[PDB]
Design a protein around this ligand. Structure first.
Ligand SMILES: *[C@@H]1O[C@H](CO)[C@@H](O[C@@H]2O[C@H](CO)[C@@H](O)[C@H](O)[C@H]2NC(C)=O)[C@H](O)[C@H]1NC(C)=O
Ligand SMILES: *[C@@H]1O[C@H](CO)[C@@H](O[C@@H]2O[C@H](CO)[C@@H](O)[C@H](O)[C@H]2NC(C)=O)[C@H](O)[C@H]1NC(C)=O
Length: 788
């Protein structure tokens, strides 16, 4: 326990400070600080135009249509470099983040330059800071204590949680906008674009996220005052000022308007030093060497974890492939955020498992606070925790930073409350998070489950730890049985609660079929307790399966048994077996081992269709009742038993699944595996999400499964390619080539890809499970054997 607290202390300190407000282009708050956090964000716009406030950047949104934004290099333990290309605002913005070795001090360098040096424009950068908590704790504060000329400012702050600190904003260079042939640029007292403007005021903690709206509102009131006039005084008109004579408070705006016709651009530093620190960040030169050191250290960590060769993809060079992989991983890590607040949950409205109409949640309530440290599918579209997405994020994160993956996993399972094992599918905390979500999707339903991909990720992590440790650094939990055992003892009761909850809530009705299964002569050899159905499906959708519009049995029936629901129970059971092994719980381990084998046997006995050579959902013939029908829509659901490694090794069924995945007339394409066979009735129909398009998450599992079932495919030996090798190689090549190409051309990683011509579709900046392309390119010997 003492060793664990020593490890957890260091982990905490290394992850305390980072740009964890991932919904912002650049926003910061300290990890796990909910009462008195220092909150920071950066906004910018072109103040030279009359309607520059309409192009004010703050939150990441696809509606901004930036040419490019994201981390080129990033690791939240260290820092990184983020770039924003904004053609509308003529701005080429780079933001560096670095930290002291103990992680308690930090600096942000904002560096801008024009995209076109002869386009008349300005870069009006607005920093805001808020020391929260004062209204609650009666002590937390942040005050400007002085300045060195107009453009360098010194602040003193107190956070009850993090202690006293100094915050400084200082210019290194940059030409402030001004017409030299005027006596002054001022148009009103405080409205002067020729120097830094600062405004302090009191904003309630819960309203701090509205920094852009408050800014626009205050500037609008100043404009109203002014006009109740040359074009080059507009920047001064759009400079914030203390019009209403607010008393100083927790919140601070700092506005700097630079002339973008000067080619060299600008640079200023924002530095935070804990009071009494032995590692103060003190000079511009010190920041410059920290940035150089930090970027090198991240490149070194990346090179230790991944390795890249020439081929088999067609990416022009190994240097370019590696850089692509680094940027993609950096954006996945850069989506990691810290969230705190209430969910909207409806527990009162009655749930009827035998009805299939959409449900009206009319008894919604504020519940919480909750908190969560998690990666996100997309900073623009989906800047929040998604339960089923996170398992896939962790499969990528774990390959780079094993211990970080354990931090995120633990955070998720902290959300399990005492009376229930339920975890919401989508985690929306507070008004800031709700602002990105249509009201119709905000209210969560505690009767609805989702695929437990977190436990698939946990299974893969425990597999590596168990392999490496034998008998019972960013990978201490992989190598140290003492540390792993303490982590496991803490989390076990939570996983168990979740496991029991999932199994009960999704229990199928085996008692129908009995007469039918007796007639087939297999009723006696199936395991009646291991059959499952997705509870809460509707006529046209099945949200609990994670693949909403993947075709299901019609009409819906309470006797349906879903092959993918059973497969997921298999995966959960496997993870329980592994954590039981780690805890030396022999009798529990052997129970889970047998349950896993019973899942395996039910998949082959019940869900395998000899006629269709496929795993299928099953249902009772609505006409006949004496007949049970195999609902067979060939696609991701059909391959899931393969992709989750539940089919017995050497099973004759393996070859048929491989044949399914290799067939160009079904789900094989030049751009990866299609979610649904081209020959299916539903292919291309309706919203067309899981009815054709290629998704990286399932594609990656299939590749991983190939290596498990056909271990020879990992060797590239000259000779005759087996069917398994042909598939493995071409799929890996097709995914790598296409995801890169779309990223190179269309700009970024996408939620899914077109079966037509492989073009990117769905949400943009999807890192996101599409970041699993990093592993496909660079993963090497994640398994641990022996090097005698
Ligand atoms: C590691 O950091 C976290 C900070 O969240 C600590 O684990 C919160 O700690 C408080 C007080 O111990 C508890 O009330 C909460 O229940 C904890 N939450 C979670 C999610 O664990 C932990 O104490 C820190 N350890 C060290 C050594 O700093
Ligand atoms: C964004 O601005 C940066 C900074 O100037 C540019 O990346 C300099 O570019 C040259 C040419 O590649 C290199 O010699 C330097 O190493 C770069 N410096 C840094 C810090 O990257 C980049 O070209 C600009 N991008 C756009 C689209 O204008």
């Amino acid at each position: 326990a003492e060793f664990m607290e020593e490890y957890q202390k260091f982990t905490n300190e290394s992850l305390l400070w980072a740009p964890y407000r991932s919904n912002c282009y650049f926003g910061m708050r300290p990890r796990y600080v909910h009462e008195s956090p220092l909150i920071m964000g950066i906004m910018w716009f072109n103040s030279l135009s009359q309607d520059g406030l309409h192009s004010l950047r703050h939150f990441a949104t696809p509606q901004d249509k930036l040419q490019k934004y994201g981390w080129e290099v990033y690791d939240p333990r260290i820092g990184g470099k983020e770039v924003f290309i904004d053609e509308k605002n003529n701005l080429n913005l780079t933001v560096y983040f670095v930290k002291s070795k103990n992680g308690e001090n930090w600096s942000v360098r904002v560096q801008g330059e024009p995209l076109d040096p002869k386009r008349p424009s300005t870069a009006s950068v607005v920093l805001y800071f808020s020391q929260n908590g004062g209204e609650i704790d009666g002590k937390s504060s942040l005050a400007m204590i002085g300045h060195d000329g107009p453009n360098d400012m010194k602040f003193f702050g107190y956070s009850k949680e993090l202690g006293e600190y100094h915050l400084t904003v200082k210019d290194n260079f940059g030409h402030y906008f001004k017409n030299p042939e005027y006596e002054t640029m001022e148009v009103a007292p405080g409205s002067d674009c020729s120097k830094t403007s600062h405004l302090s005021l009191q904003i309630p903690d819960k309203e701090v996220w509205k920094a852009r709206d408050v800014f626009q509102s205050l500037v609008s009131d100043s404009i109203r005052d002014i006009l109740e006039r040359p074009a080059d005084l507009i920047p001064s008109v759009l400079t914030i000022r203390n019009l209403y004579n607010f008393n100083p408070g927790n919140f601070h705006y700092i506005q700097k308007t630079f002339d973008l016709t000067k080619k060299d651009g600008f640079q200023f530093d924002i530095t935070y030093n804990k009071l009494g620190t032995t590692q103060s960040i003190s000079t511009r030169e010190q920041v410059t060497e920290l940035i150089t050191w930090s970027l090198n250290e991240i490149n070194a960590r990346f090179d230790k974890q991944f390795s890249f060769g020439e081929g088999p993809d067609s990416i022009e060079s190994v240097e370019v492939k590696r850089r692509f992989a680094l940027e993609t991983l950096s954006n996945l890590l850069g989506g990691i955020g810290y969230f705190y607040g209430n969910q909207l949950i409806d527990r009162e409205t009655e749930f009827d498992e035998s009805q299939f109409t959409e449900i009206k949640l009319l008894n919604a309530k504020e519940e919480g606070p909750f908190e969560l440290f998690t990666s996100v599918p997309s900073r623009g579209f989906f800047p929040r925790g998604f339960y089923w997405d996170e398992g896939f994020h962790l499969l990528q994160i774990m390959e780079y930073d094993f211990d970080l993956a354990f931090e995120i996993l633990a955070s998720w399972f902290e959300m399990i409350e005492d009376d229930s094992g339920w975890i919401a599918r989508e985690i929306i905390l507070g008004n800031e998070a709700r602002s990105k979500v249509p009201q119709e999707f905000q209210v969560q339903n505690p009767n609805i489950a989702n695929p437990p991909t977190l436990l698939l990720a946990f299974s893969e992590m425990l597999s590596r730890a168990i392999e490496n440790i034998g008998d019972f650094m960013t990978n201490n939990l992989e190598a140290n049985p003492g540390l792993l055992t303490e982590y496991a003892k803490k989390i076990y009761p939570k996983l168990l609660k979740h496991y029991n909850w999932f199994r009960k809530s999704q229990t199928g009705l085996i008692d129908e079929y009995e007469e039918i299964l007796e007639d087939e002569g297999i009723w006696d050899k199936i395991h009646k307790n291991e059959v499952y159905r997705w509870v809460g499906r509707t006529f046209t959708h099945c949200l609990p399966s994670g693949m909403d519009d993947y075709p299901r049995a019609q009409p819906p029936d309470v006797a349906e048994l879903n092959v993918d629901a059973l497969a997921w129970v298999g995966v959960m059971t496997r993870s329980m077996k592994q954590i039981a092994h780690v805890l030396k719980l022999t009798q529990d381990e052997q129970r889970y081992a047998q349950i896993e084998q019973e899942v395996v046997e039910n998949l082959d006995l019940l869900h395998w269709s000899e006629n269709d050579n496929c795993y299928c959902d099953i249902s009772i013939d609505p006409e006949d009742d004496e007949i049970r029908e195999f609902v067979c829509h060939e696609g991701y659901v059909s391959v899931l038993p393969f992709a989750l490694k539940l089919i017995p090794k050497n099973s004759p069924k393996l070859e048929k699944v491989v044949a399914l995945m290799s067939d160009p007339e079904k789900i094989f394409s030049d751009y990866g595996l299609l979610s649904l066979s081209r020959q299916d009735d539903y292919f291309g129909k309706d919203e067309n999400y899981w009815r054709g398009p290629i998704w990286m998450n399932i594609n990656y599992l299939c590749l991983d499964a190939m290596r498990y079932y056909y271990p020879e495919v990992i060797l590239d030996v000259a000779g005759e390619a087996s069917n398994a090798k042909k598939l493995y190689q071409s799929l890996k090549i097709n995914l790598s080539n296409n995801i890169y190409k779309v990223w190179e051309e269309q700009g970024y990683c996408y939620e899914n890809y077109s079966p037509i011509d492989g073009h990117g579709t769905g949400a943009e900046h999807f890192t996101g499970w599409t970041a699993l392309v990093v592993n496909i390119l660079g993963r090497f010997r994640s398994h641990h054997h022996h090097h005698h």
